[PDB]
Amino acid sequence: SWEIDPKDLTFLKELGTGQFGVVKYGKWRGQYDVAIKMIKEGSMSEDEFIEEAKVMMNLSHEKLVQLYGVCTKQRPIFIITEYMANGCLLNYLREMRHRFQTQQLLEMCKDVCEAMEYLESKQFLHRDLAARNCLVNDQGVVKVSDFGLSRYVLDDEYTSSVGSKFPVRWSPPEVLMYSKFSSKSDIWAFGVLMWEIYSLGKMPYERFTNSETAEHIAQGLRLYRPHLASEKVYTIMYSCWHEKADERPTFKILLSNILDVMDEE
Numbered sequence: 717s718w719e720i721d722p723k724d725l726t727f728l729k730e731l732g733t734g735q736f737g738v739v740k741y742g743k744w745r746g747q748y749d750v751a752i753k754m755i756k757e758g759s760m761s762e763d764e765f766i767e768e769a770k771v772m773m774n775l776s777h778e779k780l781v782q783l784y785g786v787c788t789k790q791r792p793i794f795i796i797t798e799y800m801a802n803g804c805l806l807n808y809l810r811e812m813r814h815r816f817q818t819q820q821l822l823e824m825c826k827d828v829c830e831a832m833e834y835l836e837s838k839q840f841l842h843r844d845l846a847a848r849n850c851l852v853n854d855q856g857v858v859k860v861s862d863f864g865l866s867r868y869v870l871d872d873e874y875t876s877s878v879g880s881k882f883p884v885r886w887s888p889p890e891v892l893m894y895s896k897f898s899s900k901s902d903i904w905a906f907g908v909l910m911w912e913i914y915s916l917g918k919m920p921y922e923r924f925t926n927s928e929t930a931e932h933i934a935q936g937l938r939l940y941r942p943h944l945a946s947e948k949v950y951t952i953m954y955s956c957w958h959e960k961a962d963e964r965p966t967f968k969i970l971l972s973n974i975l976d977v978m979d980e981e
């Protein structure tokens with residue numbers, strides 16, 4: 717049921733390369749757009765991912781990039797997902813031609829927050845939430861992508877909290893200090909994502925290295941208000957960065973807060 721026949725795929729354009737190698741745009745059965753991850757040899761814990769894929773198939777939300785199936789009888793294995801015509805949110809934000817209105821930026825936050833409230837309701841962690849792991853469709857809707865996949869990455873530079881690819885700038889102090897992941901580390905990352913959206917894709921802590929960032933966060937330094945964020949919007953993103961994880965909100969509370977600011981606005 718989770719298996720797609722790779723003979724049903726037509727490959728049409730290369731999208732780029734991520735942690736697991738090349739991703740392509742194609743058609744399924746001559747008709748339906750898909751994205752196809754071609755998993756590079758050595759990059760993924762494949763047997764564990766294949767077992768988890770059964771669970772991921774049943775995650776379905778309008779603001780989550782849908783997993784359609786896997787092709788596992790051959791190597792490389794393929795992961796087939798919903799196709800998002802406008803690519804990753806980070807690059808979308810950096811395209812100044814869009815001249816975004818702050819109401820559009822708030823709606824991007826709401827899109828992500830609805831997806832994360834859904835994953836929270838299933839006790840499912842994203843584990844690498846960030847604008848680079850969200851995607852944008854042809855209607856400008858933002859959806860959350862590649863949730864949970866961090867668990868199957870074999871590259872130590874990504875897994876090690878001091879590795880060159882670890883998401884230091886999206887991590888709370890208890891992750892940096894103790895590798896304590898929880899719902900509340902996804903919360904922290906979501907606040908950084910809101911900051912990315914309102915900063916039109918600037919790098920968080922852009923004047924600092926990863927090592928310096930970890931030191932400053934531990935000492936209580938925080939990101940500060942982006943020029944395009946109202947005071948009420950900044951209060952929501954800042955609430956995600958309480959030092960004490962248990963003082964951070966849930967995604968349900970964050971969603972209610974975002975909807976309130978939409979009414980103000």
Ligand SMILES: Cn1cc(Nc2nccc(-c3ccc4c(c3)CN(C3COC3)CC[C@H]4NC(=O)c3cn(C(C)(C)C)nn3)n2)cn1
Nearest residue numbers: 731732733734735739751798799800801803844862865866
């Ligand atoms: C340009 N573009 C793209 C579309 N559409 C579209 N639609 C659906 C999916 C995709 C897509 C999804 C993921 C990735 C790419 C594409 C390739 N992408 C390149 C740079 O930007 C093109 C790099 C990132 C890659 N990340 C991973 O594979 C990945 C990462 N993780 C971790 C969580 C870090 C473990 N796990 N999997 N792209 C339109 N234009």
